Each structure stands twice: as C-alpha cells, then as structure tokens.
C-alpha cells in the first residue's frame, strides 16, 4: 500500500503549504460575466432562466499536483453535452482553456476541483424565439473535492443497491449529458444514510446497475472488469480505468451489468474525478468478497494516479 | 365569449395603468437574504449547493386584479414539498405570507406571478452532517406570466403527445414535489417546436398521460372530465377545476388516463397558475373534435376566473 502513501502524503504536504501561504484566493476563484471574482462572492442572476430550470450542462476537470488532468476530454464532453441540449459554448474552446489555466494559476491551488457550466441564459426555451436565446457561461476553481476521503480509500466504503429510488431513465433525461438535476441521486444519498451506508448504487428499474450519486460503478469478477454501458455518464475516470486496464492486460466489458452480479463480485469500486478510484468493502451491509480492497482495484488505483504525470493525459500549470 | 373579454379587457387596462405609473419596482421585487431587492438585481450564491444541484422545491401563487389566489393552498403544498425533501421552510409560514403581501404591495403589480423557493442551502447533502445543513429561502414577485397568451385562449393551442421523451417517473423524482428539474419538459418543448406545435403532453412511458411542461392536462369525454392521478403535480388550478366542475354538476375522475383517450376526447385543455384554463384545439396536428373551444371547457374557464373574487379562495391586497 505504498503508492497510496506517496500520493496522499504528497497531497497532505501541498495542503499544508497552501494554508501556510495564507493566500485568500486559494479558497477559490469564479468566472461569471467576463470577470474573475473570489468564490465566496460569486453569484448567479435569478433571471438566468436556464440556471433556474437547471436547463444547463456542466463538466468538472481536475488539477492534481499542479497538472491539469485530461482537460481536453472534459472540454470535448462538454461540447457534446451542449450540442445534445441545443446549447453552444459561449466562448471558443481554446479561450475557455486559457481562462481556466489562468484561474488555477492565480488561485495557487495545486489540487483543484474545476467546474464549467453552460446555461440556456436569461430567456428560457418556453415562449422565446430562437433569436432571443443567448447561452451563458460560468466557471469555478476550488480545492479538490473527495467523494471518498483519502483516509477511507485504503479500506473502502459502504454502498447499497438503492431500493427506494431508481435512476432517471435516458428517455426522460440523457445521462450522457452531465447535468445537475440530482433529484434521484439526492434520494439515494438519504436512503444510503438511512440504511447505515454512504454510497447509493442506482438501478435502472429493470434489474441492471447504472451509476451512483456522482460516480460510475465498476465490478471485478474472475479477472474481468464490468461497468454499465447504458443509463450512465461516460466518465473520464471510467475512460482512464479502461486505459489502465488495457495497459495491464485486463479486459473491461462496457455492457449491461445485472444487479445480481454486484452480490457475487470479487471486487467493487467507484470512479469519479472528485476522488479518483474509490473501493467498496461492503454492499447492503455485507462484505464484498473478503471485505478488503482487491488486487485488481489497487492496480487500477495505482495506474490512475501514475497517468496524472503522463504528458499524453496532462500538462503542467505555471503558477 | 363575453366573460373572456371582461377578464382580458380588465387585465389590459391594468397593464396600461402600470406602464403609465412608470414605477421601476413594477418590473419585480425579490427577497434573498432578508432584504427586498429589485428583480433584475437579485442574485443567488454559487455556493448554494442546494440551488446548484437543484436540491430544492418551489411553488407559485398568483395575484389577479389585486387579489391573491389560493395562497394558503400553495403555502400548504410547499410545506408538504419541503417535508418530502427533508427540507424546512426557513421562516414561519405566516411571516412568509406577510413578506409576500408586502412585496406585491410595494411592487404595485396587480396581476403577478409569485415564486417561493426553498433550497438545501450552502452545505449539500453529500458528506455533510445533519447539524451543518441550513435551508435557504428565495422569493420573487413579477408580472403575470402566460403559458398561453390571452389572444390564444379564445381559440386554443396546438399540442402533441411527445414521442422523443417521457415523464420522469415517480420512482426517480416525486412529481408531487414541485421542482425545477425540467430536463424532460425542455426536451418536450423542443420536440413540440420541431413538430410545428407548442405544448408537449408527456406520457409515463407505459401508455398513459401525465402532464406537460408546466401544466396539468384535462380531457373531456361524454360530459365527464378526466385528468391523470399518478405521475403529475397535484395542481392548485386542477383543484379549482374540480371545484368549478362539482359546482356545475360535472364529474371529474382523477385516475389513469390512457394516451388513446386523448385522440377521442370531445375537449382538451391544460390548467396552470401561469395562465389559468388553456384550451387545446389540435393534437398531433389534428383537430380536437370540432377544433373549437368546447362548452364544458368554457364553463370551467368562466368559473375559474369567477372564483378569483370569492373570499373563500382569495383576499384583496392593500397597495
Ligand atoms: C461526474 C459523475 C460521474 C463520473 O464522471 P467523471 O468524468 O469520471 O468525473 C459519473 N456519474 C455521475 C452521475 C457523475 O456526476
Ligand atoms: C406548475 C405546474 C403545474 C400546474 O400546477 P398549479 O398548482 O395549477 O400551478 C402542473 N404540472 C407542472 C409540471 C407544473 O410545473
Ligand atoms: Na458535459
Ligand atoms: Na459505467
Ligand atoms: Na411545492
Ligand atoms: Na392531472
């Protein structure tokens, strides 16, 4: 369990140093209407009908150890999300990239959660002519967010297959469009908490796994990785999982994963930008296999963080 | 078609008078953090995790001809919406009532769209302890909004049964909780527009009608009114429709309404606070019956606006 120490110890050191620098901007910076403002003072107009009706999409790249991770993948997914929503990125993609690097640089944050939001704008879809709709852009940079805290990743967390809620189906809301309409996920969070666990796994209502509240799901069984194809966000972390798995000779099947498979899996882990590779030790109050972080999961964990220093997948920021 | 003239002519006169008064506050007033501010300057903090994840509920009473319509019904539905979301109205209900009356009074608006929003607050559900969650309140007053403009209600609008999208199911998001997660409704709006119509009727994906983008649906067939029970908001307008129908001896069945019934209906109309009683002359590009506003619909229209002057359902505002 060495590489986790090196990763987490490095993170700790950089957090210790950022508090020492006392920079007020290291609490976060936002981009709103062409202007960079401190995070705790960034505000959205109530007249942004888009934002009001959550008629928007968003995406969250990260910065780790001063390096932006797969930014172009996130920008490309955001553009595809916009197109599916009949939205348009209000600024050229390369300018968004420049602003984001500047914001991270000016903030001094070495490990950052970065968020880009495109909304319909001030005039909503209902009863407005196409000429009158002007999409709006919001961006943000802030310290890295953990869906699983570093102290838990060596042991793994507690999940449940949710039984009081199921995933919004693609015929209502396209799950490949990263969105903030979290009604089902929030029910899943409360259900997990009510049942004495932390992470909800949502079904599709048809006996298959989909995803959870802010993460994709992966099963390991007899040396093969399984993760749902339909009904889920096509995560960039999931993508990196496939890259590491291929590089290490593990097969990954992106396909229909029945709920039943979760109860027989050798290993389970979640993956997401806000936290990385997140092992699950128990499901529905029962141990996953031996209740430990599995070997294939640790290989995926190691490779995922290793690739944060591959220039094919990252670039360094000048602060 | 007299009573529509009296209603719309009165509305016109009051709009003519509000423009004459030139009051800048007659464009709207908002309540944000204890302070009343002009609408075009009201802003929401990006750190409102609730609002960000649309982890909120809301409700929209109206003011017509200087009288608040069924405010207590809306406040009661909002409280029930909060309870289902494990939210709490941050101020006592009677104080919210007082603020809203004051806001309408100070604004001078005689015909108003009024909106109350309760969000999870600055600390979201995920990874926060129950002690750290403080729900936040937002309110707004602005000129009356029409989902169907007065000029169209005498003739009726053009609807379609949506075929590219279906209603979010209650097992994902409780439709009796008025909410702003409009992903499916926005797809329905674009589909309607693509097909040359205006109003989408969403199915439940199981061959029954539910509701539309901001309105309940009612069918009239052989002297009986039909409106879906499950999968929809229990509208206050729908409630008033039942009151008028009962008073006039018409039966209303709140039950499963198959999609097939829409294609054989004698009359169809939508109902919502933002516009009232809204007849539909065509469905899927075909006439509804004779393509005219039907008689039972006009009786419902007349009674609905009549009851805006019944003290059992309204009170007058002192401006
Ligand atoms: C963000 C998120 C994921 C993970 O996607 P990444 O691109 O790896 O961050 C998966 N599912 C949902 C619902 C998410 O919000
Ligand atoms: C607001 C709305 C209605 C109508 O409800 P009222 O209380 O009559 O205003 C119906 N369905 C949806 C989805 C709505 O947003
Ligand atoms: Na996106
Ligand atoms: Na998946
Ligand atoms: Na409500
Ligand atoms: Na109904």
Numbering used by the authors:
A (entry chain A), B (entry chain A): 1 to 319
Sentences from the paper on this structure:
One class of biocatalysts, at the forefront of industrial applications, are transaminases (TAs), pyridoxal-5′-phosphate (PLP) dependent enzymes catalyzing the shuttling of an amino group between an amine and a carbonyl group, producing chiral primary amines, a highly desired reaction in industry. RTAs share their fold type with branched chain amino transferases (BCATs) and d-amino acid transaminases (dATAs), which are significantly more abundant in nature and well-characterized, while RTAs remained elusive prior to Höhne et al. (2010) describing a consensus motif. To expand the toolbox of RTAs in order to include more inherently stable catalysts, the identification of a homolog of the RTA from Aspergillus terreus (AtRTA) from the thermotolerant fungus Thermomyces stellatus (TsRTA) is here described together with its 2.2 Å crystal structure. TsRTA retained 40% activity when incubated at 40°C for 7 days, whereas AtRTA lost almost 90% activity within 24 h.
Two TsRTA chains (Chains A and B) were present in the asymmetric unit, with an estimated Matthew's coefficient of 2.7 Å3/Da (54.4 % solvent content). Electron density was well-defined for residues 1–319 in both polypeptide chains (A and B) present in the asymmetric unit, but it was absent for TsRTA residues 320–334, in addition to the C-terminal His-tag, due to flexibility in this region. Both polypeptide chains exhibit high structural similarity, with an RMSD of 0.24 Å for 319 aligned Cα atoms, as calculated using the CCP4i program SUPERPOSE. The TsRTA monomer adopts the classical aminotransferase class IV fold (InterPro: IPR001544; Pfam PF01063) with a significant content of both α-helices and β-strands (3 β-sheets) and can be observed to be sub-divided into two smaller sub-domains. The active site pocket houses a single PLP molecule, covalently bound to each TsRTA chain via an imino bond with the conserved active site lysine residue (K178) and additional hydrogen bonds (2.6–3.0 Å) formed between the phosphate group of PLP and side chain atoms from residues R77, E211, T237, and T273 (conserved in AtRTA); the phosphate group is further stabilized by hydrogen bonds with R77 and N219 via two conserved water molecules. E211 forms a hydrogen bond (2.8 Å) with the pyridine nitrogen; for other class IV members, it is suggested that the role of this residue is to maintain the pyridine ring in its protonated form, thus stabilizing the carbanion reaction intermediate. The pyridine ring is further stabilized by hydrophobic residues with a conserved leucine residue (L233) and the backbone of a conserved phenylalanine (F215).
